[PDB]
Design a protein around this ligand. Structure first.
Ligand code: WW9
Ligand code: CA
Length: 125
Protein backbone atom coordinates (compact mmCIF):
# COMPACT_ATOMS: atom_id res chain seq x y z
CA UNK A 1 0.00 0.00 0.00
CA UNK A 2 1.11 3.59 -0.61
CA UNK A 3 2.09 5.79 2.33
CA UNK A 4 -0.02 8.61 0.93
CA UNK A 5 -3.13 6.43 0.84
CA UNK A 6 -2.46 5.33 4.41
CA UNK A 7 -2.24 8.96 5.46
CA UNK A 8 -5.55 9.66 3.74
CA UNK A 9 -7.26 7.05 5.88
CA UNK A 10 -5.79 8.54 9.06
CA UNK A 11 -6.50 12.04 7.76
CA UNK A 12 -10.21 11.30 7.50
CA UNK A 13 -12.09 12.72 10.48
CA UNK A 14 -14.32 10.69 12.80
CA UNK A 15 -17.35 11.15 10.55
CA UNK A 16 -15.31 10.30 7.44
CA UNK A 17 -13.86 7.16 9.02
CA UNK A 18 -17.25 6.20 10.44
CA UNK A 19 -18.91 6.73 7.06
CA UNK A 20 -16.33 4.54 5.34
CA UNK A 21 -16.59 1.96 8.11
CA UNK A 22 -20.33 1.68 7.56
CA UNK A 23 -19.73 1.11 3.85
CA UNK A 24 -17.29 -1.68 4.70
CA UNK A 25 -19.91 -3.52 6.74
CA UNK A 26 -22.44 -3.25 3.91
CA UNK A 27 -19.79 -3.82 1.24
CA UNK A 28 -18.77 -7.03 2.98
CA UNK A 29 -22.39 -8.09 3.38
CA UNK A 30 -22.49 -11.89 3.22
CA UNK A 31 -18.70 -12.07 3.41
CA UNK A 32 -17.49 -14.88 5.68
CA UNK A 33 -14.16 -13.15 6.28
CA UNK A 34 -15.81 -9.73 6.32
CA UNK A 35 -13.70 -8.46 3.40
CA UNK A 36 -15.09 -7.33 0.05
CA UNK A 37 -14.66 -10.05 -2.58
CA UNK A 38 -15.94 -10.45 -6.13
CA UNK A 39 -19.19 -11.87 -4.75
CA UNK A 40 -19.77 -8.83 -2.56
CA UNK A 41 -18.27 -6.53 -5.17
CA UNK A 42 -20.60 -7.78 -7.87
CA UNK A 43 -23.60 -7.31 -5.59
CA UNK A 44 -22.58 -3.74 -4.79
CA UNK A 45 -21.92 -2.97 -8.44
CA UNK A 46 -25.27 -4.50 -9.37
CA UNK A 47 -26.94 -1.97 -7.12
CA UNK A 48 -25.08 0.83 -8.89
CA UNK A 49 -26.39 -0.56 -12.18
CA UNK A 50 -23.21 -2.43 -13.12
CA UNK A 51 -22.96 -6.16 -13.78
CA UNK A 52 -19.22 -6.95 -14.03
CA UNK A 53 -18.03 -10.55 -14.24
CA UNK A 54 -16.15 -12.34 -11.43
CA UNK A 55 -12.88 -11.96 -13.31
CA UNK A 56 -13.47 -8.23 -13.69
CA UNK A 57 -14.53 -7.97 -10.04
CA UNK A 58 -11.26 -9.49 -8.83
CA UNK A 59 -9.25 -7.11 -11.00
CA UNK A 60 -11.09 -4.13 -9.54
CA UNK A 61 -10.32 -5.36 -6.03
CA UNK A 62 -6.71 -5.78 -7.11
CA UNK A 63 -6.65 -2.04 -7.77
CA UNK A 64 -6.91 -1.39 -4.04
CA UNK A 65 -5.62 -4.83 -3.09
CA UNK A 66 -1.83 -4.78 -3.22
CA UNK A 67 -1.43 -7.63 -0.73
CA UNK A 68 -2.88 -9.89 -3.42
CA UNK A 69 -5.49 -10.93 -0.87
CA UNK A 70 -8.11 -10.61 -3.60
CA UNK A 71 -10.41 -8.93 -1.09
CA UNK A 72 -10.78 -5.36 0.14
CA UNK A 73 -10.47 -4.93 3.90
CA UNK A 74 -11.10 -1.90 6.13
CA UNK A 75 -7.79 -0.32 5.17
CA UNK A 76 -8.25 -1.47 1.56
CA UNK A 77 -11.83 -0.28 1.06
CA UNK A 78 -10.86 3.06 2.61
CA UNK A 79 -8.03 3.45 0.13
CA UNK A 80 -10.37 2.66 -2.76
CA UNK A 81 -12.50 5.66 -1.85
CA UNK A 82 -9.41 7.81 -1.35
CA UNK A 83 -7.75 6.50 -4.51
CA UNK A 84 -10.86 7.18 -6.57
CA UNK A 85 -11.12 10.70 -5.16
CA UNK A 86 -7.45 11.50 -5.79
CA UNK A 87 -6.97 9.30 -8.86
CA UNK A 88 -3.17 9.49 -8.67
CA UNK A 89 -3.30 7.08 -11.59
CA UNK A 90 -3.33 10.05 -13.96
CA UNK A 91 -4.84 7.83 -16.65
CA UNK A 92 -2.07 5.50 -17.80
CA UNK A 93 -3.47 6.03 -21.29
CA UNK A 94 -4.90 2.93 -22.95
CA UNK A 95 -7.96 3.32 -25.17
CA UNK A 96 -11.51 2.51 -23.96
CA UNK A 97 -11.12 -0.89 -25.62
CA UNK A 98 -13.42 -3.44 -24.01
CA UNK A 99 -12.58 -2.10 -20.55
CA UNK A 100 -13.08 1.18 -18.69
CA UNK A 101 -14.17 2.06 -15.16
CA UNK A 102 -15.30 5.57 -14.26
CA UNK A 103 -17.64 4.75 -11.37
CA UNK A 104 -17.78 7.43 -8.68
CA UNK A 105 -16.70 5.83 -5.42
CA UNK A 106 -18.22 8.77 -3.58
CA UNK A 107 -21.54 8.11 -5.36
CA UNK A 108 -21.26 4.42 -4.55
CA UNK A 109 -21.26 5.31 -0.87
CA UNK A 110 -24.80 6.56 -1.29
CA UNK A 111 -25.77 3.26 -2.90
CA UNK A 112 -24.12 1.33 -0.07
CA UNK A 113 -25.87 3.41 2.59
CA UNK A 114 -29.14 4.13 0.78
CA UNK A 115 -30.33 5.17 4.23
CA UNK A 116 -30.15 8.11 6.62
CA UNK A 117 -28.60 5.67 9.09
CA UNK A 118 -30.03 7.54 12.07
CA UNK A 119 -30.01 4.46 14.29
CA UNK A 120 -27.50 6.10 16.62
CA UNK A 121 -28.55 9.22 18.52
CA UNK A 122 -26.09 11.29 20.54
CA UNK A 123 -26.64 14.69 22.16
CA UNK A 124 -24.91 17.01 24.62
CA UNK A 125 -21.56 16.05 23.10
N1 WW9 B 1 -9.95 6.59 -12.95
C1 WW9 B 1 -10.21 5.24 -12.45
C2 WW9 B 1 -10.17 5.21 -10.93
C3 WW9 B 1 -10.59 3.84 -10.40
C4 WW9 B 1 -10.10 3.67 -8.96
C5 WW9 B 1 -10.44 2.26 -8.47
C6 WW9 B 1 -11.73 2.26 -7.62
C7 WW9 B 1 -12.96 2.19 -8.52
N2 WW9 B 1 -12.92 0.98 -9.38
S1 WW9 B 1 -14.42 0.41 -9.66
O1 WW9 B 1 -14.36 -0.74 -10.68
O2 WW9 B 1 -15.29 1.53 -10.23
C8 WW9 B 1 -15.12 -0.18 -8.15
C9 WW9 B 1 -16.40 0.20 -7.84
C10 WW9 B 1 -16.98 -0.23 -6.67
C11 WW9 B 1 -16.28 -1.06 -5.79
C12 WW9 B 1 -14.97 -1.46 -6.09
C13 WW9 B 1 -14.21 -2.31 -5.23
CL1 WW9 B 1 -14.82 -2.92 -3.72
C14 WW9 B 1 -12.91 -2.67 -5.59
C15 WW9 B 1 -12.37 -2.22 -6.77
C16 WW9 B 1 -13.09 -1.40 -7.61
C17 WW9 B 1 -14.39 -1.01 -7.28
CA1 CA C 1 -6.38 -6.87 0.78
Amino acid sequence: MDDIYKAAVEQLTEEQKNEFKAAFDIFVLGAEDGSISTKELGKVMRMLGQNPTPEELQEMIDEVDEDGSGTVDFDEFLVMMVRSMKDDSKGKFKRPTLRRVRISADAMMQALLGARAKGHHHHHH
